[PDB]
Amino acid sequence: DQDGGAIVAQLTQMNIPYRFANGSGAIEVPADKVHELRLRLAQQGLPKGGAVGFQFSEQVNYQRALEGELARTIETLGPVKSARVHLAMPKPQKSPSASVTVTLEPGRALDEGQISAVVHLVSSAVAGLPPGNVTLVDQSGHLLTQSNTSGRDLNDAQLKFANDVESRIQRRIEAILSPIVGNGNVHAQVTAQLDFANKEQTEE
Amino acid sequence: ISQFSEQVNYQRALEGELARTIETLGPVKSARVHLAMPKPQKSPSASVTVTLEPGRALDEGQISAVVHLVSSAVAGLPPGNVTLVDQSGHLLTQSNTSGRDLNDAQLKFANDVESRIQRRIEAILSPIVGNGNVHAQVTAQLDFANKEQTEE
Amino acid sequence: ISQFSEQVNYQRALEGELARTIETLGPVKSARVHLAMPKPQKSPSASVTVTLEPGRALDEGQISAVVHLVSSAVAGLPPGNVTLVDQSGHLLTQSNTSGRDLNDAQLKFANDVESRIQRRIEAILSPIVGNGNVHAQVTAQLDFANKEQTEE
Structure with missing residues (x-):
């Protein structure tokens, strides 16, 4: 795997601890540094995160x-x-x-x-x-962060805007009631109905 | 030299x-x-x-x-x-741009509204009776008909 | 030499x-x-x-x-x-940024107004009862309709 060559090069800068096995898909690094490693390696290494630190039931x-x-x-x-x-x-x-x-x-x-x-x-x-x-x-x-669908994107915008208004009002209520009863002693959920129809009017 | 060749x-x-x-x-x-x-x-x-x-x-x-x-x-x-x-x-998929994919998009949008309302109910009602002691399912009917109106 | 090649x-x-x-x-x-x-x-x-x-x-x-x-x-x-x-x-998110620009603009402008009023109230009430002995939250309704009028 060519990506492994792009992964061993990143490590050789940090501390150079590794043990490259005979297989090209496996790399061995002490686990104490793998804890922090597999965060940068995620941002860099795609396939399976093969950083090992130190019939139906088969797959389960x-x-x-x-x-x-x-x-x-x-x-x-x-x-x-x-x-x-x-x-x-x-x-x-x-x-x-x-x-x-x-x-x-x-x-x-x-x-x-x-x-x-x-x-x-x-x-x-x-x-x-x-x-x-x-x-x-x-x-x-x-x-x-997942909020998207194949639906009409105008409706997606309407949904996200409604969620924004909901979040703002809920934040305000939580902030005002927090100092009295405590930090974690209150919850609130708000639902709103919005207008999306064009209108005009003329009076004489 | 020809225009067509240059375009190519x-x-x-x-x-x-x-x-x-x-x-x-x-x-x-x-x-x-x-x-x-x-x-x-x-x-x-x-x-x-x-x-x-x-x-x-x-x-x-x-x-x-x-x-x-x-x-x-x-x-x-x-x-x-x-x-x-x-x-x-x-x-x-664009075989029927105004048809079947549009209807599928309607299905996804309905599912999205369902999911949002179900999440709201679950979140509000969870802290009282317990984390895993409640389930909710929601169904909705939506409008997709173009309408106008005028009054004098 | 040709104009098209120069533009390229x-x-x-x-x-x-x-x-x-x-x-x-x-x-x-x-x-x-x-x-x-x-x-x-x-x-x-x-x-x-x-x-x-x-x-x-x-x-x-x-x-x-x-x-x-x-x-x-x-x-x-x-x-x-x-x-x-x-x-x-x-x-x-350019797909329908047109719809979701005015909405966020109105939200942020309303937030600005409420923040200013809350700051004024906090500043005026701070010196009397203490520095950290008061909180205030303000909500406002705004008019965003286009209106005209003529009188004779």
């Missing part, structure tokens, strides 16, 4: 093993205390998706670069997964 | 440039591009064939991005006429 | 100049630009492809800056027709 066994490995990898992220990844296969074309359950630190929060990194990690770690199919999810809030 | 060379130059622009993306080995512009009033069309890296499959948004590249590279070419095809299947 | 060279010169203009920015590795101008009335279009530095992702204001560069570099090219795409996905 690795499937659970792969899910646990990705859960451990995402668990080591800074603003993440624990994480778990669920992988879905096409039962019977069917697009394969995946769900990533993550527990964050109370004080920290995820950023857009981190969202891109984690979604690309999950998509790359399993073959045949478009990154659009991967869905992040947390305990209380949901932090994702 | 221009088209080859554009095809090469567009291809070379396309391989710059990550998940693709290579691509080949063909164009068709009516010289003397039909919209121009284009066809793109992509040889794709095996371990990765492309997105819908990436389809939109490539279609936008091809559509904006040519003055008169609308994004509808772009056709992208991969080694296995064609990653675009 | 002109377009390449402009594309290269805009390229080296673009890589002068910090976060960008490289970029290539294609243009389309109708010779004989359709607005010209442009497409920009940018390969980006790995550790950085570019911002919305930077998107607007690049679009303004491309739009103002060409006389007849409106800012809408610019299309920008990155290595992975396209960083421009």
